[PDB]
Curated annotation (Swiss-Prot):
Protein name in the entry: Thiamine-phosphate synthase
Originating species: Bacillus subtilis (strain 168)
Encoding gene, per UniProt annotation: thiE
N-terminal signal peptide: none
Positions of 2-[(2R,5Z)-2-carboxy-4-methylthiazol-5(2H)-ylidene]ethyl phosphate binding: T147, E148, T149, G179, I199, S200
Pathway annotation: Cofactor biosynthesis; thiamine diphosphate biosynthesis; thiamine phosphate from 4-amino-2-methyl-5-diphosphomethylpyrimidine and 4-methyl-5-(2-phosphoethyl)-thiazole: step 1/1
Lineage: Bacteria, Bacillati, Bacillota, Bacilli, Bacillales
Induction of expression: Is weakly repressed by THZ and not at all by thiamine.
Keywords linked to the UniProt accession: Magnesium, Metal-binding, Thiamine biosynthesis, Transferase
Taxonomy, superkingdom: Bacteria
Enzyme Commission number(s): 2.5.1.3
SUPFAM superfamilies for this protein: Thiamin phosphate synthase
Family: Belongs to the thiamine-phosphate synthase family.
Length: 226
C-alpha cells in the first residue's frame, strides 16, 4: 500500500479499473468528500481526483480538498489517482496520475513519477499504441456514450475502439469512459474493457453508495462471464 518500487502488473491494474470513480467538487450538489466516501463504501475500486474548470476549487483550498479525498481513499484501501497535475501527485504521494492527449507528454510524465500508476486518455488506435510505447499502465477509451460532464469531448465512439484494440492483440489494461450508467456498462466489459469509469452516474445519484455497489456487483458478473 506504499509507494511502488516497480511498475504495476497488468493483472493488478485490470482489477483496479473495475469501477473507476472520478470526481471534483463541481460534479455534485452534495458535500464533495461525503460523496467520495459513499462511493468508496459502495465498492469503487479506484478513484481519480479531478478538480478543474469553472467553480472548481483552486490554490490551498484545492490542495486541502485533495488531502481529504486521499485520506478517504486510504481508509477504504483504494488507490488515489490525480488528474493532470503531476506536481500535486508527487507532493501528496498519490498512487497515480492520469493525463490526456493535450497534457504533458507521457514519456516526460513517466520519467517524473517513477513507478507510479500512469493512465492516458486515447481516442484513436495510433494514440493507444503511442501510450503503450510511452510507458502507460492503462488507457481510458471513450466517449463510449453521450456526455456533457466534460466540456469539449471528442466524437462518441461506442465500444468500437475497445474492440479494435483487442482485435489487434493489444492486451494493455483498458477502462471505458463517457456517459456510462448502471444500465449500459455490460457492453463495455463485453467488448474487452477491464472496467468502467464514471463521474455523474455516481456523483449525481440520489444514492451514491447504492449506485457504486450496483456497479461493483455488475462488473464482477460481467468479467466472470466473458
Ligand atoms: C480514465 C479517464 N479517462 C478519460 C478521462 C477524460 N474524460 C473523458 S469523458 C469524461 C467525463 C465522464 O463523465 P460522465 O461519467 O459523467 O460522463 C472525462 C473526465 C479521465 N479523466 N480519466
Ligand atoms: Mg487532461
Amino acid at each position: 500500500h506504499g509507494i511502488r518500487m516497480t511498475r504495476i502488473s497488468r493483472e493488478m491494474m485490470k482489477e483496479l479499473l473495475s469501477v473507476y470513480f472520478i470526481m471534483g467538487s463541481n460534479n455534485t450538489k452534495a458535500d464533495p468528500v461525503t460523496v467520495v466516501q459513499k462511493a468508496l463504501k459502495g465498492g469503487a475500486t479506484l478513484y481519480q481526483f479531478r478538480e478543474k474548470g469553472g467553480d472548481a476549487l483552486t490554490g490551498e483550498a484545492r490542495i486541502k480538498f485533495a488531502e481529504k479525498a486521499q485520506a478517504a481513499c486510504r481508509e477504504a484501501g483504494v488507490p488515489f489517482i490525480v488528474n493532470d497535475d503531476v506536481e500535486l501527485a508527487l507532493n501528496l504521494k498519490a498512487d497515480g496520475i492520469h493525463i490526456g492527449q493535450e497534457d504533458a507528454n507521457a514519456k516526460e510524465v513517466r520519467a517524473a513519477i517513477g513507478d507510479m500508476i500512469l493512465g492516458v486518455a486515447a481516442h484513436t488506435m495510433s494514440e493507444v499504441k503511442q501510450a503503450e510505447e510511452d510507458g502507460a499502465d492503462y488507457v481510458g477509451l471513450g466517449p463510449i456514450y453521450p456526455t456533457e460532464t466534460k466540456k469539449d469531448t471528442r466524437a462518441v465512439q461506442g465500444v468500437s475502439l475497445i474492440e479494435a484494440v483487442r482485435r489487434q492483440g493489444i492486451s494493455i489494461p483498458i477502462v471505458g469512459i463517457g456517459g456510462i450508467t448502471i444500465d449500459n456498462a455490460a457492453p463495455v466489459i463485453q467488448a474487452g474493457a477491464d472496467g468502467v469509469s464514471m463521474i455523474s452516474a455516481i456523483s449525481q445519484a440520489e444514492d451514491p453508495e447504492s449506485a457504486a455497489r450496483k456497479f461493483r456487483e455488475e462488473i464482477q458478473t460481467y468479467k466472470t462471464g466473458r
